[PDB]
């Protein structure tokens, strides 16, 4: 991603002689013999870069083409999201159809289980949530948003919600079964991800956050627990419990302490910028093997976060420290992803210049680590859990606060 017309300060489809006029203007603004502020020298090369393209008519051709294609991909993506947004899927299955096997993980919401549908013969992963542990949280809202959003979104790195249904005791969400395990387990076991290893994962998140933000969605809970590794070694984001559609600022305090951006901790409001903060924490924890901000208890994590004092390990390249320093920015007018150039500041950073953005999206890059596939329906990249049977009571609980499901 590069935005040549904005560098020169011109509308698309401006006249080549206004492209020349724009260049000679901006070129005078950041000329080394005239301006010496440290950022000017790189905006100078970026103004020269924009002119070398926009004046060569065949290179302005490739660039103007790749742009309408982006415009259509964003407009078709947004189209797909809103139709399924307002026409969501409900009661697309029933628990009798699925044979339960192993608990893949257990969370405050409920269980996630490996299931085989008996007719189709396919394996899936079912998230069971108990309406009685969730109507108490008063975060019926956060679990309603998770259904509406997960159905209705499409991206190579979001997990796909095949079926959803409800009964008297629980809500159910059946999803594509990612078998490589959680990134959490791999990272803890190794202790650390190598810098190229982390960059691969990081890139798919920048692409997912670009997608999700383009749809006015904040994801709000990035952590290794929530990132699963498919068989091609790529990333499936799998937990949307905190994702909300937001215009302006939102205020719920939620997500995971280590990953909470400062502005959430303060009563101040917040927006999609918090996901860019989280990415910095995610990159940090992957490269170091620990997050930049821990303590015995959340309140002291919140304190370390708002201070904006970060320490980096001895390993950690200089470009890594420069990138995190920009992501982990308490100043909302200085944090990459929030500036005028948006995701490009992240896509075009020196820590990423070795990453073919489009090849990531089309999953054509070799993955630094492929899990050992042991045959369909193996659960050995997942920890083993104590199995609690599903009980459905004679009476339907919370039938109202979950009318929409």
């Amino acid at each position: 991603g590069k935005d040549y017309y904005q560098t020169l300060g011109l509308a698309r489809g401006a006249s080549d002689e206004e492209i020349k006029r724009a260049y000679r203007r901006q070129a005078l603004r950041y000329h080394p013999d005239k301006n010496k502020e440290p950022g000017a020298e790189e905006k100078f090369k970026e103004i020269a870069e924009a002119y070398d393209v926009l004046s060569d008519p065949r290179k302005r051709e490739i660039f103007d083409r790749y742009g309408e294609e982006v415009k259509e991909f964003l407009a078709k993506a947004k189209e797909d999201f809103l139709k399924k947004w307002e026409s969501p899927a409900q009661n697309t299955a029933h628990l009798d159809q699925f044979e339960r096997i192993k608990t893949l993980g257990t969370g405050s919401f409920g269980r996630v289980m490996l299931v085989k549908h008996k007719e189709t013969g396919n394996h899936y992963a079912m998230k069971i949530l108990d309406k009685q542990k969730v109507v108490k949280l008063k975060q019926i809202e956060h679990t309603l948003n998770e259904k509406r959003i997960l159905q209705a979104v499409n991206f190579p790195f979001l997990v796909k919600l095949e079926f959803s249904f409800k009964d008297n005791s629980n809500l159910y969400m059946v999803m594509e079964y990612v078998p490589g395990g959680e990134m959490f387990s791999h990272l803890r076991r190794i202790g650390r991800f190598s810098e190229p290893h982390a960059r691969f994962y990081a890139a798919q998140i920048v692409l997912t956050f670009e997608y999700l933000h383009s749809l006015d969605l904040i994801y709000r809970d990035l952590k290794p627990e929530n990132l699963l590794i498919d068989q091609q070694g790529y990333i499936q984001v799998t937990d949307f419990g905190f994702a909300k559609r937001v215009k302006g600022r939102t205020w719920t305090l939620c997500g995971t302490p280590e990953y909470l951006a400062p502005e959430i901790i303060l009563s101040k409001g917040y927006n999609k910028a918090v996901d860019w903060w989280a990415l910095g924490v995610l990159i940090y924890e992957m490269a170091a093997g620990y997050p930049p901000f821990f303590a015995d208890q959340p309140i002291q994590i919140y304190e370390k976060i708002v201070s904006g004092k970060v320490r980096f390990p001895s390993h950690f390249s200089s470009d890594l420290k420069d990138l995190l320093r920009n992501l982990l920015q308490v100043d909302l007018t200085k944090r990459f992803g929030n500036l005028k150039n948006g995701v490009n500041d992240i896509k075009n950073h020196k820590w990423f210049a070795t990453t073919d953005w489009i090849a990531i999206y089309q999953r054509k890059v070799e993955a630094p680590f492929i899990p050992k596939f042991k045959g369909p329906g193996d659960t050995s990249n997942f920890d083993d859990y104590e199995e609690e049977e599903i009980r459905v009571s004679i009476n339907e609980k919370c039938g109202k606060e979950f009318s929409e499901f």
Partner: peptide, 20 residues
């Protein structure tokens, strides 16, 4: 730095979520 401090913090396993 402080990886052994990370292990002492007891926040090394799967972290739960705030919901306020």
């Amino acid at each position: 730095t402080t990886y052994a401090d990370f292990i002492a913090s007891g926040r090394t396993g799967r972290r739960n979520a705030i919901h306020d």
